[PDB]
Design a protein around this ligand. Structure first.
Ligand SMILES: [Zn+2]
Lengths: 196, 79, 209, 147, 87, 49, 753, 49
């Protein structure tokens, strides 16, 4: 849960839950989708080439041949690829009828499913994750450093040192800035302010 | 005396008080209203504020230099 | 044009009078309203080759409240300004024995003359307004709020209600055009009253430095 | 016909050779928005897959192979030129554009626990570490021994 | 000039000690007029006679894991002064 | 416009390893081709315009 | 959770099935595109044949563009209409747009219609290859598709020529995302140092650190901006006839009263004049109120952000107390009038008994109070809302709870909060507002405001024509030019220095006819005539606009160098208006020819034929929008807009510009802050800056409550001089050494300290 | 990278197959790192004698 996966048409997305074959929407011949990308992402960005390759891949899979999608082939209008898919028996335009997995009831709207190439980006949550608490400290400046385990914490830089003033929260600011990073008590002389 | 400050408690004095009262209860301080199935210092103390009974008096220093000193009971609970 | 000079002069004078009515100097509404054609009738067709003399536009008036204190507007006939000419006016004022007076410098003045105006620092205070500036009544422009002035007594009361030392109050510099038009001096509070949308009228009192 | 022109001197070999070595891995680029295709070439500089075929002897830091790289079902004609049916960078997934439980909103993909269990996208993350014996000291030797 | 001020009525570099002596004669009232406040600041106080050495903490010793004790650089400056001052 | 003498719209040439900008006719003369006619035909080829 | 369960039993999915359209629409769209190709071809031939006319205040090339951009823009929209109409009630694309969760009506158009025109830098893809836009096209090609229109829709796919163009068009967006990214924290990081510690101290005086009073009562009203919502004032806009008709509580009809109110009150209302007087005084107070409001909100907006929303509250009260609106009232009308006063005494932003603290409360709540009086007014309460006694009580009480609670909390860091709130839209605005002459807006303009740098990309002063002139462009045009600076170069037709030793030498005969007239009275010619003299020709087409008179040109040319220049005007009727000017005849009585060449250049440049010098261009647009139309309260008592010419001009010289006659000197303002300070004073700058920021955060359609606007525009103009608040501007500050050790001079300031 | 204007980054029309238009990095290096199209071939250099 967290690893980036992305298609070849500009849509990049981390996983949000994973679910087992039984509790997932299933086609009426048993074909449960291995990835369920959101419908909302396609509109505003208009990648209406991801959905065409979704149709052609289905045509190619049932006809057993790598399907060519050269930028300009002229032999691939959306309609011509679709009529081939219709013979195999699917909705000419790709939709298939799925059923909710948990309840079994047919999802009313017919989901659009198909085969689409997915590339697994190198970035992973394990590399990104950082955590700190009573961590190793540099003796010279006594402000947190880094040892094993990525124990160098985040930084309260001025921008976020200023929303805190706006919220009005002084004690968090005092805690984050002093107690958390460099708490020291030094004995000071009263008549002269020099240290003692 | 002449209180010129608003009667209502300020959004931020209901925070430092709820928190201060809470460090007292956690440290074993006496409590001032019945607590039932409740062991959490903030819930025990947010309850007291509902009843206007916390033992604290708020020194609102005015801009010029004089400490008007309203008390929890007089201040109207804003929530 | 010579007719333009008449038009310009009529206006310069017209606003000049209003300043005094506002400053608190006594002026007849009739004088403020003198129409340009009336101005032509009163002073003549043109200063150049005509009755207006570049002099006589000059006038002396006293506070409506107090006749003892009078202010003499001097429109130097000489377009450029020579200190001796002011000294002549100063002598005229010494006779008048009224300290307040103003000079409508038409274009430019000797630098020495300006220091010389400061030279009579507390004597017969006089002020210089470039002719161009007086052409338009800044106080009627949209962005300019309606400045009003306060007596020393009012200033004390204001400080008391807010318990404010005067230095803490917002500050308006004397040189700014509005101040000269209301004839402000250091240490005097001019309140500003303006319409503002969230409330209605917010009156902000600003001291000068 | 009513020609735009009759003097054409030169005609282009195929117009889809005006796109480079990483926008030729994208089918139907014209159909997609142009910024989306730029973002995908950037994502490709990120996707893993088999790096070169001597992965076993090379030993670079940070190198990730993938268990089952698969050639794409929909292929741009000019991918073959860039050795892509020899070094593929991903797996054809039965994807289904739909809104299900909610965990798929805002660029999130739901995924089948069962399929990532039959091998779909399993990968190895090799990371090489090197230590060099130093004899810098006049008497200081960093010898190799079991302390 | 750079590190030395030379005064010509006769043109000679000004002795730090002599300038220190002049400031010793300086009147407190005149220093107040100068704008310096005498209680926490004196012109005589300005000349340096004793070098405060910061504590070992501000100049820590980095032993790089048992190789040896690389001296903190600031220590080097203090050290040269001592060798030269002693001679 | 400033001054730049009575002459205006003067062609001027900065050159490698110099101090102040050099008037163009001079550089041409210095390379040679002193005759003012020679300089002219070397630049403007046709005198008809 | 519930709607996610509903999505589980229903589902949503977008598919190629939604990006395809019925053949009628697929062909219907083609026909609209074919027309564009036909019409654009008409513009090309009309211009190619030179038939096309030039357009007012625009170059011919620009006219071609203005005309072609019109035909293409309609084509995207018209092919746009047919496409959206076809999608059913099941098209998935449409449901996402209508919900507003994702997608746009333009997006639906680009995926089923015509991608539309592609552009770079607010033009069409430019000729980059000499006279072409890509190699394939023939040179000098002005075809719409070739220049940049990508007719093919996304589903159809882009031909290779247009694909390249679409990419160029996207590149600028990816170039912007990077310019936007850097300025993300630039503005706030600088501003916060300047608004670092303004707080609402315990007596409500917003005050900075030194304790100086930046704003006397927060935001001028004392209400903190969270509990304030927009309401319609309801009295400013209505006509005078209406103002009486709507609110009055006439005690005359009786039968009306009979239907509206219970009888017991009915007889008394007729019976007691004292009751009746309160009503007439009540309406009277409101008459007075409308008058104040009319000035307070001059243009005619009725929207305010005043606190507790009286309208909703009445409705809520109607339900809680189950009032039935079809039957008679129980509220004595008088109860309302006293009741309102009672609320008014209780709501207090300021609480001081003495005058100076009693004047302020009235000033602060004048708007809310006028609203309370208009909305809760008895005639209305009795008629429109028909509330009952038990309920009126909940309402007065509730209005007081919300109003009293809306007062800002003392100790709020209103200063730090205001600086960040303004910054969010600062990032949102465009990179330079070339498009939406040029206006500079976005973070570049917001910068000119933050640090007061006088130089602007577009220093400009709007001019409001004083009156009669605006109605008629003829007077307007002359004044417009009257201000504009003009010089000989603009009207010059040709210049010459032929040698004429004697006047009768007359090298050109055409000059001789009037030269003979000059020679008829060759006054001072006896001193001499220039052996070589300058002859100047000008073109009337340029002269006509200026309505220039040669005599004017002559007197002014004479008026400057002096008798050293002598010229006689050519006959005006003569088409070849020419000025033959020669050096002083006594001077003829250093080489004069060379002197003349210099003279010609200086003369051509500094003619200053008319107008203030700095302003260089004046454009005149009558304003179709309500933004600046003069809005007058009419005799019957109505707000209506009068369409009057306004002259927008570049350059800034308010003193002279304002000085010129017929320039209303009341409403003409610069777009530049420095000018305002010098000629109108610091207080005008404070009102002006608010206008300047408001223009910037209006282009977005964004809103920032005025509260935040005033504080940035008052803290900045506070010590009396406009203060640059970029890190450099406030870098000089009244601060403790530790505070002034906050900026790079930490070692130096401390040693001095 | 930070000349205020962005003249070079804007794709000029003369990149018809000289450079791939789609391939541009996002960041401080936008449109200042371009990649060649598949068929370009930079000249190696010859002698013009
Ligand atoms: Zn001591």
């Amino acid at each position: 849960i967290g690893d980036k996966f992305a298609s070849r048409h500009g849509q990049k997305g981390t996983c949000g839950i994973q679910y087992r074959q039984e509790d997932m929407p299933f086609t009426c011949e048993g074909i449960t989708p291995d990835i369920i990308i959101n419908p909302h992402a396609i509109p505003s960005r208009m990648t209406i080439g991801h959905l065409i390759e979704c149709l052609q891949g289905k045509v190619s899979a049932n006809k057993g041949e790598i399907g060519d999608a050269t930028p300009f082939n002229d032999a691939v209008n959306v309609q011509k690829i679709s009529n081939l898919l219709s013979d195999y028996g699917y909705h000419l335009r790709g939709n298939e009828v799925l059923y909710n997995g948990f309840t079994g009831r047919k999802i009313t709207s017919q989901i659009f499913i198909g085969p689409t190439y997915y590339q697994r980006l190198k970035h992973m949550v394990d590399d990104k994750i950082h955590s700190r608490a009573r961590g190793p400290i540099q003796i010279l400046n006594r402000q947190p450093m880094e040892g094993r385990s990525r124990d160098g914490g985040l930084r309260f830089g001025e921008m976020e040192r200023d929303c805190q003033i706006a919220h009005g929260a002084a004690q968090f600011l005092r805690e984050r800035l002093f107690e958390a990073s460099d708490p020291y008590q030094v004995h000071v002389c009263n008549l002269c302010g020099i240290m003692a | 005396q002449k209180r010129i400050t608003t009667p209502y408690m300020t959004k931020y004095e209901r925070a430092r008080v709820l928190g201060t009262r809470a460090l007292q209860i956690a440290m074993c301080a006496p409590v001032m209203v019945e607590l039932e199935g409740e062991t959490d210092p903030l819930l025990i103390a947010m309850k007291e504020l509902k009843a206007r009974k916390i033992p604290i008096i708020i020194r609102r220093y005015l801009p010029d230099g004089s400490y008007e000193d309203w008390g929890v009971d007089e201040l109207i609970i804003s929530d | 044009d010579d007719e333009e000079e008449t038009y310009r002069l009529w206006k310069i004078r017209k606003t000049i009078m209003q300043l005094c009515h506002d400053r608190g100097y006594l002026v007849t509404q009739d004088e403020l309203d003198q129409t340009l054609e009336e101005f032509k009738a009163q002073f003549g067709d043109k200063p150049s080759e005509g009755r207006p003399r570049r002099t006589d536009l000059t006038v002396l008036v006293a506070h409506n409240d107090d006749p003892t204190d009078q202010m003499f507007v001097f429109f130097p006939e000489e377009p450029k300004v020579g200190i001796k000419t002011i000294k002549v006016y100063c002598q005229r004022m010494q006779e008048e024995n009224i300290t307040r007076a103003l000079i409508v410098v038409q274009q430019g003045m000797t630098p020495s003359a300006k220091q010389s105006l400061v030279d009579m620092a507390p004597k017969y205070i006089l002020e210089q307004f470039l002719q161009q500036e007086l052409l338009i009544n800044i106080t009627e422009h949209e962005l300019v709020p309606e400045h009003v002035v306060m007596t020393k007594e009012e200033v004390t009361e204001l400080l008391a209600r807010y318990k404010l030392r005067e230095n803490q109050l917002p500050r308006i510099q004397a040189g700014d055009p509005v101040a000269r038009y209301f004839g402000i001096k250091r240490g005097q509070v001019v309140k500003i009253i303006r319409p503002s949308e969230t409330a209605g009228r917010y009156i902000t009192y600003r001291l000068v430095q | 016909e009513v020609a735009y022109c009759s003097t054409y001197t030169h005609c282009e070999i195929h117009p889809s050779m005006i796109l480079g070595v990483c926008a030729s891995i994208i089918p139907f680029p014209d159909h997609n928005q142009s910024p989306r295709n730029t973002y995908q070439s950037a994502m490709g500089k990120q996707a893993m897959g088999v790096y070169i075929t001597n992965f076993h002897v090379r030993m670079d830091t940070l190198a990730h192979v993938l268990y089952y790289p698969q050639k794409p079902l929909v292929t741009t004609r000019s991918m073959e030129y860039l050795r892509f049916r020899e070094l593929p960078a991903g797996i054809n997934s039965i994807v289904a554009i739909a809104s299900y439980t909610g965990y798929n909103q805002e660029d999130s993909v739901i995924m089948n626990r069962s399929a990532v269990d039959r091998g779909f996208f399993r990968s190895v993350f090799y990371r090489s570490y090197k230590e060099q014996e130093s004899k810098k000291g006049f008497d200081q030797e960093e010898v190799f021994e079991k302390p | 000039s750079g590190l030395e001020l030379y005064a010509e009525w006769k043109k000679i570099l000004l002795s730090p000690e002599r300038v220190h002596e002049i400031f010793k004669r300086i009147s407190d009232e005149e220093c107040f007029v100068l704008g310096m406040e005498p209680r926490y600041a004196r012109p005589e106080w300005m000349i340096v006679t004793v070098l405060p050495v910061p504590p070992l903490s501000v100049r820590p010793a980095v032993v790089m894991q048992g190789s040896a004790r690389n001296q903190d650089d600031l220590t080097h400056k203090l050290a040269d002064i001592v060798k030269i001052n002693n001679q | 416009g400033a001054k730049k003498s009575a002459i205006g719209q003067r062609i001027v040439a900065t050159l490698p390893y110099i101090k102040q900008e050099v008037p163009i006719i001079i550089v041409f003369r210095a390379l040679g081709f002193v005759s003012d006619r020679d300089i002219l035909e070397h630049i403007i080829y046709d005198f008809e315009d | 959770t519930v709607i996610n369960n509903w999505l589980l039993i229903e589902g949503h999915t977008i598919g190629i099935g939604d990006s395809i359209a019925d053949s009628k629409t697929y062909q219907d769209i083609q026909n609209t595109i074919k027309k564009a190709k036909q019409d654009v071809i008409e513009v090309i031939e009309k211009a190619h044949n030179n038939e096309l006319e030039p357009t007012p205040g625009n170059t011919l090339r620009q006219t071609f563009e203005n005309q072609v951009n019109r035909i293409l823009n309609d084509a995207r929209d018209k092919t746009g209409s047919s496409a959206q109409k076809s999608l059913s009630e099941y098209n998935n694309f449409k449901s996402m747009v209508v919900s507003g969760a994702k997608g746009s009506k333009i997006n639906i158009s680009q995926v089923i219609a015509v991608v539309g025109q592609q552009n770079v830098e607010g033009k069409r893809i430019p000729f980059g290859f000499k006279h072409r836009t890509l190699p394939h096209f023939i040179k000098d090609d002005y075809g719409p598709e070739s220049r940049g229109f990508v007719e093919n829709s996304y589903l159809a796919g882009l031909t290779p020529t247009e694909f390249f163009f679409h990419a160029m068009g996207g590149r600028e967006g990816l170039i912007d995302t990077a310019v936007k990214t850097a300025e993300t924290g630039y503005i706030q990081r600088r501003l916060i140092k300047s608004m670092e510690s303004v707080m609402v101290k315990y007596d409500a005086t917003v005050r900075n650190s030194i304790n100086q009073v930046v704003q006397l009562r927060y935001g001028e009203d004392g209400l903190a901006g969270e509990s304030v919502e927009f309401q319609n004032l309801a009295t400013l806009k209505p006509s005078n006839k209406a103002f009486e008709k709507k609110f009055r509580f006439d005690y005359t009809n009786e039968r009306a009263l009979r239907r509206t109110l219970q009888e017991d009150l009915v007889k008394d209302v007729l019976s007691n004049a004292h009751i009746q007087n309160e009503l007439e005084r009540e309406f009277e107070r409101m008459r007075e109120d409308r008058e104040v409001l009319r000035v307070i909100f001059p243009t005619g907006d009725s929207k305010v952000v005043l606190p507790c929303n009286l309208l909703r509250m009445i409705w809520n009260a109607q339900k809680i107390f189950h009032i039935n609106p079809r039957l008679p009232s129980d509220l004595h009308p008088i109860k309302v009038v006293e009741g309102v006063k009672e609320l008014s005494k209780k709501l207090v932003i300021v609480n001081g008994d003495d005058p100076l603290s009693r004047q302020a409360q009235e000033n602060a709540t004048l708007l809310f109070n006028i609203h309370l009086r208009s909305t809760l007014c008895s005639r209305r309460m009795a008629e429109e809302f028909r509330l009952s006694g038990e309920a009126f009580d909940w309402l007065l009480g509730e209005i007081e709870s919300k109003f009293n609670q809306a007062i800002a909390h003392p100790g709020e860091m209103v200063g730090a909060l205001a600086a960040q709130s303004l910054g969010e839209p600062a990032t949102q605005m465009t990179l330079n507002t070339f498009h939406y002459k040029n206006v500079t807006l976005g973070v570049p303009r917001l910068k000119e405001l933050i640090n007061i740098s006088k130089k602007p990309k577009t220093p400009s002063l709007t001019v409001f024509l004083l009156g009669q002139s605006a109605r008629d462009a003829e007077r307007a045009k002359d004044i417009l030019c009257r201000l504009e600076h003009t010089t000989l170069r603009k009207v010059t037709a040709n210049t010459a220095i032929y040698y004429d030793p004697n006047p009768q030498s007359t090298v050109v005969a055409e000059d001789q006819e009037w030269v003979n007239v000059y020679y008829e009275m060759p006054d001072f010619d006896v001193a001499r005539i220039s052996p070589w003299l300058l002859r100047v020709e000008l073109d009337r087409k340029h002269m006509t606009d200026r309505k220039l008179t040669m005599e004017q040109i002559a007197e002014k040319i004479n008026a400057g160098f002096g008798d050293d220049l002598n010229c006689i005007f050519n006959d005006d009727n003569a088409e070849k208006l020419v000025l033959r000017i020669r050096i002083m005849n006594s001077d003829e009585n250093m080489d004069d020819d060379v002197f003349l060449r210099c003279i010609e250049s200086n003369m051509l440049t500094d003619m200053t034929l008319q107008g203030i010098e700095q302003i260089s261009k004046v454009y005149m647009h009558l304003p179709q929008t309500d933004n600046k139309k003069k809005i007058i309260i009419t005799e019957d008592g109505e707000f209506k807009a009068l369409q009057e010419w306004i002259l927008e001009t570049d350059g800034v010289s308010l003193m002279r510009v304002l000085s010129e006659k017929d320039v209303d000197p009341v409403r003409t303002t610069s777009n530049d802050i420095v000018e305002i300070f010098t000629v109108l004073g610091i207080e005008a700058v404070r009102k002006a800056l608010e206008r300047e920021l408001y223009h910037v955060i209006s282009f977005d359609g964004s809103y920032v409550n005025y509260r935040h606007l005033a504080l940035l525009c008052d803290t900045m103009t506070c010590r009396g001089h406009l203060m640059a608040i970029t890190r450099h501007g406030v870098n000089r500050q009244d601060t403790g050494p530790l505070m002034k050790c906050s900026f790079e001079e930490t070692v130096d300031v401390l040693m001095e300290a | 990278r930070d000349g205020k204007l962005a003249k070079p980054r804007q794709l000029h029309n003369t990149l018809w197959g000289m450079v791939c238009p789609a391939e541009t990095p996002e960041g401080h290096a936008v449109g200042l790192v371009k990649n060649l199209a598949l068929m370009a071939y930079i000249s190696v250099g010859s002698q013009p004698s």
